[PDB]
Amino acid sequence: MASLTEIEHLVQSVCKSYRETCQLRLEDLLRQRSNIFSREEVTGYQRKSMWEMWERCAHHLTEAIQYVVEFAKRLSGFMELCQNDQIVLLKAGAMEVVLVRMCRAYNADNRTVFFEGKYGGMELFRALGCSELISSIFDFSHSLSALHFSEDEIALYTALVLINAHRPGLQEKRKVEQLQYNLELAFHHHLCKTHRQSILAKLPPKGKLRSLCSQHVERLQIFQHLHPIVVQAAFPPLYKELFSTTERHKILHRLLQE
Ligand SMILES: O=C(O)[C@H]1CC[C@H](C(=O)N2CC[C@](c3ccc(C(F)(C(F)(F)F)C(F)(F)F)cc3)(S(=O)(=O)c3ccc(F)cc3)C2)CC1
């Protein structure tokens, strides 16, 4: 299995799939760095209802997920996996891929993130009532900024975040293991060739991404208790499907069968 040329073709493939499926251009995110929210605009966001902020944030997250599904569809070997495994992998990895992709929209110089047209800090998200989660997200992006990833490095790393053979519920585990192995080789080969093997030890532990997702699900269940009809009426169906709590994932299935 997999010669050196198959691995080199894989590297170019994963990078191509990633470039093609990014919600935003890195070039445009970097140009907008100067475009920072005014204290009036900040006050505006801070004065918005909890449920309005959640609805806006669930919408922007659903947008990002949509592109991650597209990344998975274009990812070499993913469509060869059975529909159960496709759902298992996306249900668990899509948020994690979004969280990794997020660092590109994070400015480490100040401590701002690109949100709804301009750059703003933590204070922008005060109304959500989930300060701990917001702080965890900002630190996570901050720690990734330190590694100074290239677009190819994010491409190869997110491919692995998604193709994780240890996810509970995998039917054809061995099939995911061989796809994981080849993607790990592709990442490692590109790191070797570019003299960037050093970042491997510096990468965040698998426990840090797991906690962010767990926290998100925890905070969402609190919000759903206070405003359950906001969730029923104004939350994206794909968001409810992946986080509310072929079978119970009709939207994800339709997106895959396209
Ligand atoms: O594909 C790409 O090129 C990228 C993918 C990532 C995109 C991005 O930055 N994001 C996708 C939407 C973003 C996003 C991230 C996290 C969450 C939440 F967890 C919580 F709000 F709690 F943080 C929630 F669900 F609970 F509400 C919602 C939505 S956002 O722009 O709405 C944003 C929200 C909060 C931030 F603190 C920073 C940004 C982040 C930018 C474009």
Curated annotation (Swiss-Prot):
Coiled-coil regions listed in the entry: none
Tissue expression profile of the protein: Isoform 1 is widely expressed in many tissues, including liver and adipose, and highly expressed in skeletal muscle. Isoform 2 is primarily expressed in immature thymocytes.
Resulting phenotype, residue 115 to Q: Completely abolishes transcriptional activity
Motif placement: AF-2: 238-243
Domain notes: The AF-2 (activation function-2) motif is required for recruiting coregulators containing LXXLL motifs such as NCOA1 and NCOA2.
Family per similarity comment: Belongs to the nuclear hormone receptor family. NR1 subfamily.
Function description: Nuclear receptor that binds DNA as a monomer to ROR response elements (RORE) containing a single core motif half-site 5'-AGGTCA-3' preceded by a short A-T-rich sequence. Key regulator of cellular differentiation, immunity, peripheral circadian rhythm as well as lipid, steroid, xenobiotics and glucose metabolism. Considered to have intrinsic transcriptional activity, have some natural ligands like oxysterols that act as agonists (25-hydroxycholesterol) or inverse agonists (7-oxygenated sterols), enhancing or repressing the transcriptional activity, respectively.
Name this protein carries in UniProt: Nuclear receptor ROR-gamma
Protein encoded by which gene: RORC
Location of this fragment in the whole protein: 265 to 508 of 518
